[PDB]
Amino acid sequence: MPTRKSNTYLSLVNSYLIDSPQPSSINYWWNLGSLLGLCLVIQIASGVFLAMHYSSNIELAFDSVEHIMRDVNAGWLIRYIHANGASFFFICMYLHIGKALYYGSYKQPRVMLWVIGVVIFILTMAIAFMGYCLVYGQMSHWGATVITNLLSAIPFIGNDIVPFIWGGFSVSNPTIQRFFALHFLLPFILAALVCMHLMALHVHGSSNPVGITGNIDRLPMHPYFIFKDLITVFVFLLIFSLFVFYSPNTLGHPDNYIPGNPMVTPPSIVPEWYLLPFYAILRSIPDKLGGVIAMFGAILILLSLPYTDRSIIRGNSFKVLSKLAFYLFVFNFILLGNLGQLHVEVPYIQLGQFATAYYFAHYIIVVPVISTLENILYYIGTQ
Amino acid sequence: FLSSFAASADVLAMAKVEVKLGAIPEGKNVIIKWQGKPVFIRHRTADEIEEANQVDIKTLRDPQNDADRVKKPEWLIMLGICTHLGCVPIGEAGDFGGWFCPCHGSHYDISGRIRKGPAPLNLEIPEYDFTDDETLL
Amino acid sequence: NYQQPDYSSYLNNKSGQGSRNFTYFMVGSMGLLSAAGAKSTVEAFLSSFA
Amino acid sequence: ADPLDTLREECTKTAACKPFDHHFHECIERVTKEQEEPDYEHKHYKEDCIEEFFHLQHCVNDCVAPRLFNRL
Amino acid sequence: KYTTLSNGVTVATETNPAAKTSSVGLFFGAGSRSEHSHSNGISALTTNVLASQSAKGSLLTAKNDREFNGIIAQTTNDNITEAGKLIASIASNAVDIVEKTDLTKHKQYLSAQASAVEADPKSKVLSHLYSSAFQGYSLALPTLGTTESVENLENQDSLRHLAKHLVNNNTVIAASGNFDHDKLADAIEANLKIAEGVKPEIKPASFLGSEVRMRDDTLPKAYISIAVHGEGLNSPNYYLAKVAAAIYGDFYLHSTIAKFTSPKLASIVQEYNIVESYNHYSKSFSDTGIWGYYAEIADKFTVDDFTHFSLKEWNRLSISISEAEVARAKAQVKTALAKELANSFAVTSDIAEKVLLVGHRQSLREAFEKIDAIKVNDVKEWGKSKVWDRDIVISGTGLIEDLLDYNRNRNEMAMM
Amino acid sequence: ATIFGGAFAFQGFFDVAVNKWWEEHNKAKLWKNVKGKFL
Amino acid sequence: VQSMTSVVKAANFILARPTLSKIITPLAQKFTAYAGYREMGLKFNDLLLEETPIMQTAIKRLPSELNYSRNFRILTAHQLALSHQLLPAEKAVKPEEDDNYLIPYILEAEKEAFEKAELDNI
Amino acid sequence: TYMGWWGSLGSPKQKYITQYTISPYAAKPLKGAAYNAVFNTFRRTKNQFLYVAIPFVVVWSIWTRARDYNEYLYTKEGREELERV
Amino acid sequence: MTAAEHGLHPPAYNWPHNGMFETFDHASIRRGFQVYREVCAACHSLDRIAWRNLVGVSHTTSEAKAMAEELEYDDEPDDEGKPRKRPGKLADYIPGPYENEQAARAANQGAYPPDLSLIVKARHGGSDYIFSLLTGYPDEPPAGVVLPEGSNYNPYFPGGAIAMGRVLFDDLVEYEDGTPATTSQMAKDVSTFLNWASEPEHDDRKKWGLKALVVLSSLYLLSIWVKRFKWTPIKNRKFRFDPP
Amino acid sequence: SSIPNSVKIAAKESATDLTKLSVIINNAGSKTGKSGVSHLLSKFTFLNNGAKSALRFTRESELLGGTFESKVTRDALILNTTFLKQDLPYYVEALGNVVSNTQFAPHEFNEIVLPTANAETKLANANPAFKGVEKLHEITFRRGLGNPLFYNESTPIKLEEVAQFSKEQFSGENISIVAEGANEEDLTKFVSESAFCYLPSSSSNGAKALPTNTFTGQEARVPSSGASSALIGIPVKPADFGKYEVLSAAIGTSTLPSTSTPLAQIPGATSHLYKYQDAGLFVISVSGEASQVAQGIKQAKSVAESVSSSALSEAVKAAELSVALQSTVDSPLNVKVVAEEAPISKFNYVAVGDLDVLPYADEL
């Protein structure tokens, strides 16, 4: 047999990259996964080069970041990468979830895969948030403070878990040090989760924009979809350069460049942009315990989605009503993200409550109701 | 092994800033550094403690009461800022003659509530758990 | 066997060994541009070690 | 004279900026009238011309911005 | 030996006293390559009609090749002259014979043959490979036509075909066996009477790298074929192309010598029994050729492995072929040429093909001398020119799910 | 391999092209061109 | 996922009643025309989620001609999606050719599965 | 599983389908890139526009109403209504 | 929030260094540093900038070194334990006018003039904001607003009240290259210098960005071509289905 | 010619300057040993000699360009070789070391022989016509010439049996070297100095040839999948080889593939006179769809009989042509084709395929 199959290591590399029988009808959206993996490398790569200079002490975290920017040779490049690349990591992850929601990539044969997806999502958010707390700017510190205060709402253990998180009585040196350690670490746990993701993908393969089985026409991957992966990768890197080199702080918040001071809260507290939607949900629910439960449900209800989707046809590409519902859901998610950064004001409190209501109603009402209606409509129309 | 995550000596102790309650005189500023921030406190005077008990919480726009504010009766405290946005606290000035939010000249009551002036919300309490003949924060 | 679809419009106008030579040129140019970019990035990162 | 002040003077005289300057000046007059009454200190809502000033300054900035650094 | 009779027709004979049996045949060029889609198969139908005539004790058979057609009357040596006259008659009355013919029965016979070449997996694979390689030109057409086109042929079509192609300038009388050449020539001259006419212009053809996949999952094997633009009968590389093909030679897994055949590919594919059988060939037409291999893979999971290894062994052609392989290929090609030229029927067919399509036939001794002049560097130059990195044409019939699409196999043609 | 060496060709070509276009587009602003006025 | 037994149950619940039939069926045809799968050569039953044991059995029990026609239609749909082009109106699948060919086999599969489930809980 | 390797991908018995193709190096690359990227892209956008526009129009109308109301509230004329809320 | 609270949004001045391919006007960086030392050093620290950072940007190494000797810094105390001081050197960071935040607040009516080494990346409008702030003071505060004692009205400051008070006045500084010192010119120069101080990599960053865009755009076009070329066989597939 | 072993040598010039050397072991064919021994022996012939192994002899032969095969025939075991005229001294020597001191190693019996023999048997029997012909020989010549031509697992053979059949056979009187295109004197010298000189004159303890014992009037049926085939077999004395060669060519023979013959007018039909040393079998076969074959075999039967003596005489020249075509180097043929009438009433019948459709002998 060829060396690319006889050797176990090259056999694995072949099974996943060179001969993976990808369907012939996959759009460019299926490239997002590769980008995500690429980003996972970049986050790690630049990340490993920031810890070589980052000092996790609370009195040195911000000064250490500025030392990276000003003193290290390419330190500005490494930091701007590690940050805007996280922003792009979440852009690609949201696009990868949107693709999996539009096309029924979460349906039966791949439910397991979907589950790891969700877990990855959850884990990633933690990592990102934790990493952000390492900068220890104003917004960094106060985001950590708000997060821990909200987690203080667990019924009984809440009063005791928070000191274990803080490592003290407030966000301080132990908190930043443990965040740095767990932030260096959890990316490798996420790499393991990504390996599990790829295994669950390889067991049943990838879906199609048409939804129908691809087994009738499948293509290798080395001459096909590796050179499509290169288009997607180079577009990603071109936009990533337009951000990193030109206007690299657009995605960040200026207040993060003011060193953290517990005695002065900044005018507004917002997470980094990609966590804004969930933050909005958190504020839509008045109760703190209610808010945290509702938020974690907003993330976990993706697990319920494969069972609430009563559609006989995989995917939305051939479904009229479901496409409208999906785009309405996407735009409501963007609206939630927008409301996340806006102050809790007269119209916005009610608008955010309604947006959260519809966000959950999507999964638990609209997807099942619309899917059933469209099944009946398909059968009646053909007859 | 998970006990490492918990407050570390240098934190379990030292973080709780025990200070003698008896030393403070009733009328003056016993301005203290606590929770790594200002921690100003006055052991309550007998007349002042009584005056507060009589004062109606409903009368104040702020929804707070002296009884909830003070854990140990005579001994209590506030963290370091007269106004909701930090205002260095002046002593014995304001609507009730308790403190002046000098940064805006706003009025802080003996209660410490945002009695008047720019404070968006009433002044917070530096770890309010002071007890016995000592304080702690 | 049968009548093939007419590809006349799809056929290239260029020589048999010439078009593959041009393909070699651009594939190698892509490879060496990527090598130059990787060299720049790796040098920039390792310069932090100094 | 610095270019910035002359640019503000030119822009505020522009037709687009004229209505904002108008509104701002009668706002100033109205607020001075409100300050004339002896009960001004007791009024809960003591008007101010911050909003009209902001509108005027935004409409003047939208004109000065593109031209100023050609003067320096 | 050659003699151009009256009418300008040429009688070419290769007489050998040791010949077991004699043969003489009239060939008039213009096979399927001279047809077009609507009237495809008319040459085969006409030749079958002519060959169905009374044999007067001889054995009258049709040729039906891609580019030339003819009727051959095999017979024992002493009877050869009679057979001569026979075919002459059959060709001097070709138009009459066609006119008086009820093409029904001959058309079911030709349709049965066309179905046969579409059922025998190797015949189907090679016919499809030729069709796709030369797609858009008459050379792509089947030799025997398709079942759809055969049924649509009528007598007037065959008459037009004969009138166009059965002319003195386009016909040759080939013979072999043990007989006096002059006697046969005289016997044919007195009896041959065919219309005058110019040799029809031979239609153009150009190779086009392509892939055709008739995947039938119901078959028990995968019958594939892969080839490059080879060498036509005119090219001086003709024998060089044959030597290159023989370097890789044949292979049948269940044959006893399967474990001992010289070619490296044979040793490579027996490690996991990748392939059941294969055979390398250099098909040569008048001006263009197809040089490649046919293969039957029993294990449907190893088609890709076989294609990969075979194309790698082709890559070896331009770099690492040793003098041992070149000498073996030379000897095997010489032996194959001598085997192909033993039966008098084969010798007659070869004489007709060469004389019609190249005008001159190189004797077997001249062919041996030309092959023995090949060195390893000549073979490697040919590999660089024609095999290394050149477009390939592919064909497959059944269980070809594992036959990776074109780009994989095409890129295998240049990786070291 | 030749990849390592060839990468230098393209890297140097683009680097010199940009480091010759940049100090021409910005020659009026760079330090080395302005230092004369303040010396 | 919704079973073809339940889908057909609801469809016959609607079709039996003239008011709902008149209101929906025009909307059903309009929805199926706007779905756009017919423009790619696919019949409705080609869209069905194949990756289920019931559905896998249903395809595995199709006749030869229907199986090969389904294979060709699926391949044509894949190619059309691959090349980002649609069949012209004359070549698209007409409403009368969308004949619900696979539904009976899926219904038989679900009947077998439902009887097995019912008898296991006898 | 529902997707085996190349030898057996789980596709049903496939038969009678002939797949023709031409090699690269013998086809016009980017044959209709310029004309297609305009006309076919416009066709695809035309087909898929409404599904993105109707939800977008609804959501952005809601957002515009909320934004305009919020801007109105914080003005010298919106003070009273802001107090009432 | 109210328009006053958010602060008037600074406009977009066409700075010489906005476009994707323009550097800082290093003449403006030098002039801005002059204005800084002359005016801003009375109140503002600007700690994260070391004299060495100025060599090759706005000052020749000799000038930066000389400016270093002009100041005193704390050295390791003598072997006898007594405190000792040394003239400044390039490696030393620029010193602020106050020993600690307590001193700064004491000397500025409690207001703490923030360190300017990140004031451009730590404000919404960036450079523009600083400019709009330094020239945003109106001669007459808008009618009706009452400022806390010691505060001056600046619409671009969130809340409308800023403890700074106008500092830049006409001809306050004699520029070294004879440039006129209008208040707008000084404001532009200071904003540019502070933007450099907050983004010393700006010029290098944008040059590297230009090189990266050239490389990646050429490579992306090559990838587009290669993919379309290698997919021509697939997009050109033609099928037939011919059952009996 | 001959040598002291009595090994006959025949040599004659050839047309295509290839020395198509061949050795014909007279009675080591499928008739001699127990059913299938000759097949395995033929598979052992060229593998391991006492002089050169398989992987050496095959490689050298391919370098020399020659071809070699071992085919089993009911009369004789034929070792064919084909090589350029320069190559005689090599191959002849090899052939000697093939007849003498062939190794017969068990690892070849299990890896190269039994697998190959089984594959060849399965491939041949997949053809209904060949299965029918084997059955026809079985039921016409019950033993000897009727032994299955190929190894079948129904009659297990152990290596010792094949080795002991190589010995006790291959004797000097039992092998006949035939060459085409090699000087008879040079070939005689090479054979005399080769290993052929060491073979015993005759087998001491085997090769007791049995009488032919032709049986007629029998029939058989062999159910099979796919294509069907009905065959009719006339046993014929050697002296009748002339009559039936004329008959076969008169109606249509496999050696002469041609339309216009009466038997070629019906699909799948053919005829052939298998010729052996002491008997022959004239087989008229039809193959294809069972329904087609049912009528085809009856039509072929009616054609074989009722052939006009005038047309039979006309077919004499075609029969002579067919005999000349068949007389290869390995299978020398000497049959005088006469037009004498040939009866068919004594036919055996065998049916293969859809036995529910194919007729019985009683329907002819």
Ligand code: HEC
């Ligand atoms: C004397 C005291 C000065 C001088 C000479 C300058 N500044 Fe400014 N500064 C000063 C005070 C009292 C404050 C308090 C700010 C407040 O009340 O919130 C400041 C603040 C700033 C800021 C902060 C702006 C903001 O946070 O929105 C900036 C920016 C700033 N100062 C910059 C600056 C510049 C560029 C100067 C040039 C000469 C400058 N200051 C002078 C006090 C003083």
Ligand code: HEM
């Ligand atoms: C998917 C995985 C990861 C994501 C999404 C991610 C994301 C982020 C983000 C958004 C920040 C904020 C930085 C800023 O705003 O300036 C950050 C900080 C940081 N990250 Fe990562 N990161 C990942 C993995 C890693 C890894 C593996 C390391 C290994 C060292 C690492 C090291 C750091 C460090 C040291 C910081 C401090 C920021 C600084 O000093 O500027 N990260 N991360």
Ligand code: HEM
């Ligand atoms: C580092 C992060 C991730 C990596 C590297 C990764 C990897 C991949 C890869 C390589 C593919 C195949 C290409 C493609 O289908 O786009 C894929 C598909 C998929 N991604 Fe991920 N994944 C990641 C995160 C996620 C997350 C967070 C989710 C959902 C919450 C998710 C859901 C999916 C699903 C369901 C598929 C299958 C798509 C289909 O078959 O149609 N992935 N993933």
Ligand code: FES
């Ligand atoms: S908040 Fe600044 S004065 Fe109370």
